[PDB]
Amino acid sequence: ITQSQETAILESFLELVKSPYGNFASIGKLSHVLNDPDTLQKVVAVLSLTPQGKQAFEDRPMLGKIDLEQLHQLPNYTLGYMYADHMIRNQLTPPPVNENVNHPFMFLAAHLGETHDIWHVVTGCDTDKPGEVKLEAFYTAQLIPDRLFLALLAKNLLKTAMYEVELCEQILDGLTQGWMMGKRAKPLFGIEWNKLWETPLEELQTSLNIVP
Amino acid sequence: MIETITQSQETAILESFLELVKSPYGNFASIGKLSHVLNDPDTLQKVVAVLSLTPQGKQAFEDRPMLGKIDLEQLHQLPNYTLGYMYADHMIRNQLTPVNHPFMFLAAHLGETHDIWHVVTGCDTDKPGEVKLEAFYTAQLIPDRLFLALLAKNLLKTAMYEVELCEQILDGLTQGWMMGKRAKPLFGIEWNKLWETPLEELQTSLNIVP
Ligand SMILES: CCCCCCCC/C=C/CCCCCCCC(=O)O
Ligand SMILES: CCCCCCCC/C=C/CCCCCCCC(=O)O
Ligand SMILES: [Cl-]
Ligand SMILES: [Mg+2]
Ligand SMILES: [Mg+2]
């Protein structure tokens, strides 16, 4: 990499070390500079080696508009109930329906962006700090050879060492668990979640080889 | 964290971390500079106190046991299965070469047994082996901050410069972390009187399962 690209990476990395979790603007900035088109094409090609991956780039399945209230009426063992409950408790607002996902790079980012909270629920990762690290290790296992989630792991390890080292064991226990769970699970990329709202979460996890 | 990391400490820690990111592995100078600003005396005091909770830890700060001079050639005359031979062999193959205050003993004991921890834990010398060993250290030296920050810098270096190692690097981290929590404390061991112990028996005694 050029010295210029390197300084933009390190500057974004420093902003993430110094700011709270969930700094999506700086994560996006780090992403732009860290995952270049060559990296993104290799991720697209790897994900495309499975039939579910290949089809998802062809069909570009999107979530669509989500009715949190209606999902919250489902039986409380379903994916739909659990997802809605996760959104209420964490004060999260569902993703805005997006339309420009033509290029594979744009579908990759839009699909992963809008299903982030669903992957939280399906992998069983809490939204506390060790749970975010756990989910990032899970992403790292599934999106090889991506660079972003590896760097997000690094940023959270440094943040732990500098500001809150009492969390060390819980943070590395989470990273360790999400890495192993990520290697063992089936690919989550490309799944059409809005057809699974009434599926019981535990059976969905079992069929995905997720053992929470 | 109840103690402060001041603005000034944060600035010095980040500058030291950036130099480690831009330098190759094995920069023991720059690692010492990160250590000095990151493991400040409050942290070193807690590490000493935590390590002194065991009898071997307490004794090690009293007696301050040091390796002393070591004759690699003589150690390399021992049976193949021994710690002494295995260590000497490790030094020869990689062409490596080998205090009254608690914080000074702490740093000098860990610095001089670093190669021995490599041998005893079974960590290779390549980059994934260093990360494995670093994870082993952060399991054993809670509430230290240096080794966690060293994991962070090697994950960032992998993301930026050598992403194809990602799998090996996180497999190494994961194995070292688990092995480190499961093993008995390695700190404070007088290795100079274990050279003739078969390495595999010493590992069993220490609950090290490679
Ligand atoms: C494989 C290439 C990936 C490029 C697209 C990445 C965009 C995916 C969007 C989901 C990112 C969610 C990560 C947010 C973590 C917040 C916790 C933290 O601050 O560490
Ligand atoms: C608990 C307080 C620790 C204070 C002692 C600090 C020094 C410890 C001994 C040095 C360990 C060397 C580990 C460095 C591995 C080199 C690979 C790399 O560059 O990442
Ligand atoms: Cl939650
Ligand atoms: Mg979420
Ligand atoms: Mg999250």
Automatic annotation (TrEMBL), chain B:
Keyword Metal-binding listed? The answer is yes
Keyword entries, A-Z: Metal-binding, Plasmid
Q: Which domain of life is it from?
A: Bacteria
Q: For binding Mg(2+) 1, which residues are annotated in this chain's numbering? A: 114, 118, 130
Q: Where does Mg(2+) 2 bind?
A: 115
Tell me the protein's name.
Answer: Alr8543 protein
Q: In which organism is this protein found?
A: Nostoc sp. (strain PCC 7120 / SAG 25.82 / UTEX 2576)
Q: What is the lineage of its organism?
A: Bacteria, Bacillati, Cyanobacteriota, Cyanophyceae, Nostocales
